[PDB]
A = this chain, B = another copy of it.
Amino acid sequence: QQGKVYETRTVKSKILGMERSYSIYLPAGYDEGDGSYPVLYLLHGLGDNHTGWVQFGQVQYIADKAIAEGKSAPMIIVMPDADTVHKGYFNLLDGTYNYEDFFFQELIPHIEKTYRVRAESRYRAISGLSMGGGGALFYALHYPEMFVAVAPLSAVGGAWTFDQMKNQSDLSKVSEEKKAEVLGQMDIQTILEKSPKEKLDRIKWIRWYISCGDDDFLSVTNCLLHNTLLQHQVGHEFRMKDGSHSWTYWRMELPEVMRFVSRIFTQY
């Protein structure tokens, strides 16, 4: 019936030189039997940390119910802290805070070693809201081989994300050639047009679920994303539902994201 949440566990990060927090939801029956589970990485927005999806997202109640009713197969849900020290998901421009490196090289392997996780891309999905929606989006565009399904909710765009990366970096140490390089790596149109074919094929292979409310200040950004993806022949699910930039919207979408990635995990 009931899964459980741990909020206080940390990962020893060599890349960030500190203990990094995360929250984790383990499904009901994790403690019986010996099997392993697929994983959904679930990213918070600006101003929250790893407790955001727990306290505001109510992940425990919502995941318990979805799994118990059969709307979702059992899965582990990992909620990283991208708030402490610096807020955001990507490597800072001054080289002092390689958060994206930490996520892929330390957090994911730590989860797969510490919990009974099916450690394959076909069993790995990522979702997030606002800042975390852009995090999910560009994580998958940068490393499409690492995910089978991606669900950006009310996602911020690349220009906002890049602007936030600059405002947290010491730009005295950043060359102008470097600013231009990342700028392109944080631009959807550039990634889709200039990536090698192998990378583009994998991006098309990913199952995308993009959802944003019609009253959200990001509704135009996400409509432009829909159009850009179709222009580049990246099939995806797109939803514009009634709602705003609010936790009412994100709690409504969480069981939909769970059903979406679960069907991909189990096949159909």
The chain A residues found within 8 Å of chain B, CB to CB, are 1-2, 4-9, 23, 28-29, 32-36, 38, 51, 54-56, 58, 60-61, 65, 70, 73-74, 118, 123, 214, 219-220, 223-224, 226-227, 230-231, 237-242, 246-248, 251, 265-268
Number of copies: 7
Q: How far is the CA of A214 from the CA of B237 in the complex (A)?
A: 7
Q: How far is the CB of A131 from chain B (nearest CB, A)?
A: 16
- Chain B residues near A55 (CB-CB < 8 A): 38, 118, 123, 265-266
Q: How far is the CB of A47 from chain B (nearest CB, A)?
A: 11
A246 and B230 within 8 A (CB): no
B238 and A214 within 8 A (CB): yes
- Chain B residues near A214 (CB-CB < 8 A): 226, 237-239
- Chain B residues near A7 (CB-CB < 8 A): 33-36
Considering the complex, give the chain B residue whose CB is closest to the CB of A230: B220
Q: A65-B70, A214-B239, A240-B226 are in contact. Are A33 and B58 (CB under 8 A)?
A: no
- Chain B residues near A237 (CB-CB < 8 A): 214, 242
B2 and A29 within 8 A (CB): yes
A266 and B226 within 8 A (CB): no
- Chain B residues near A51 (CB-CB < 8 A): 35-36, 118
- Chain B residues near A238 (CB-CB < 8 A): 214, 219, 240
A267 partner, pick from B56, B224, B226, beta carbons under 8 A: B56
- Chain B residues near A5 (CB-CB < 8 A): 33-35
B266 and A247 within 8 A (CB): yes
Which of A28, A123, A240, A241 gathers the greatest number of chain B CB atoms within 10 Å?
A240
B230 and A226 within 8 A (CB): no
